[PDB]
Structure formats: C-alpha cells, structure tokens
Amino acid sequence: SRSELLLEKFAEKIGIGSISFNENRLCSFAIDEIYYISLSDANDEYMMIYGVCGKFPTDNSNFALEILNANLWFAENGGPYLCYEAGAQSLLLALRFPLDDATPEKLENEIEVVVKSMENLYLVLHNQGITLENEHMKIEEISS
Amino acid sequence: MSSRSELLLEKFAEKIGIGSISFNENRLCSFAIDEIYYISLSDANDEYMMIYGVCGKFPTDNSNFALEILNANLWFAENGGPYLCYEAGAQSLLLALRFPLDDATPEKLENEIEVVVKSMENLYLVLHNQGITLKIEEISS
Secondary structure, eight states: OOOOHHHHHHHHHHHHHOOOTTTTTEEEEEEEEEOOEEEEEEEEEEEEEEEEEEOOTTTTHHHHHHHHHHHHHHSSSOOOOEEEETTEEEEEEEEEEEEEOHHHHHHHHHHHHHHHHHHHHHHHTTTTTTOOOTTTOOEEEEOO | OHHHHHHHHHHHHHHHSSSOOOTTTOOEEEEEEOOOOOEEEEESSSSSEEEEEEEEEETTTTTEEEEEEHHHHHHHHHHSEEEEEEEETTTTEEEEEEEEEEEEEEEHHHHHHHHHHHHHHHHHHHHHHTTTOEEEEEOOO
C-alpha cells in the first residue's frame, strides 16, 4: 500500500532490491559495523594488537586534539593507546601483548579489550555526527 | 681593555641575561644549564593515582604537530607506557601514567615518577632533534 510503495521505493534507493512485506507484514534487514583488528609479530617478547579505526582526517587539527585528549581516559582506565600511523594515515588503537605466559584465551581477551575501546571510540564520534573515512554501514534484507 | 675573546664572553653574557662574567686565572669560565621537568601527582580515584609529565603548552594552531605526537604514541604504546595526552584546561602536552595503590610503596612511586621523567626525556630529545620546541647561570671554574 502506501507503505509497500515506500518499502520498495526505499529498496530502489538503498541499492539492494526486490523488497516486500511478507505474510506477517514484516520485512527484516541486517546491518553491521565491521571492526578491523591486526596482529603484528612485533618483536620476540611482545606482539602488537592494532584496532584500525579508519583513515584520519589530517586536515582537521581540532580532531587530532580531541583524540589526543581522549587518551587521558585511556590512560586512566585500561589502555589501548590512541595513535596515528603515518603510512596509511589511519587512526590506530594500540595495545602490546606480552608473549611470556601468553595464551589464546589471553590473546582473545586482549583483542576484546581493543574492540571494546573501538566500540567506545566510535559511539562517541557517532553521537557527535563524526564519521571517519573508511566507515561503511552495509545493509541487506533477510528472512523476516 | 680586553682580548676579543674576553669581549665575546662579555657580549655573550650581557646578551644571555646574566651579568659580569670573565675567564678565571685558568682562562676558564663555566656555566650550568638546567633542563627542568615538571611532574604532578594526582589523587584521582581511591584505587589508582595519576602521574603527569607536564611537557609544556600545546601549540593548538599546528595540525601537523598534533599528528606527530599522535604518531609518537605508537612508540610509547610498544614500550612501558606513559600516554601522550592533551589537556584542554591548560592546553598542555601531558605524559600520563596511572599508579596503583594496591601494594604501593614510595619506592614504587619513585620508579614510576622516574619512568615518566625518562619518557619526557626521550620525547624532548626527539622533539629537539626535529628543531621543535614548546636556564643558564654562570658557576665556579
């Protein structure tokens, strides 16, 4: 109806297509925030975990400062360091991982710490409208 | 009258701010130059304390600077760990490190204060070896 016409006109404009309300008058969708993590075989005592947050706006100094300021918070609590990797010019959340007494479960938790930091970093940016460059919200329908 | 050597010493002295300088009987004249480091202990919460290395006033006009400091944090991130932070209030460049009270001892507080100092030392040296920048007095020879 006036809805189906919107549901569909929504599809044609959203990229994916052939969308319609099912039997129960529902039309479900899945969306996701994909988080990038990288493990670096740094040296022989430590391993480095990087939470790649996306390209950094290197033309906005006001941003670099609210990031640098956010470190106070990461300095008080847990600890991934907020950094800038010149090469790919990205925003990085860094956390060294000690190999001594290492364990996949410890590695699992340390990686979880970094992603929870990204969660928090993002929420704050999202709640301020900010959106890094390599950020993409992928949508697609599923069985309602 | 004085040799152009003594002359230079004097013009140097008067220009540097200190006054009345000359070469002693041995043709010597010594100075002491200080590189002060400001540390601040903070009674943050009741489970952790916070050691701050106040490095100076952060030039908030330079987009490039902020980025170089952020890139330096990669280094601190690999090593022990004082964080390179920015404090809006005083617009200062901070080197932050938390200190746990559980089993704390002045010895532990002394080591920690000393790591922040050494971090400020690696920082300033990398900053100065870049020409970047955010007290001399004569003494006995």
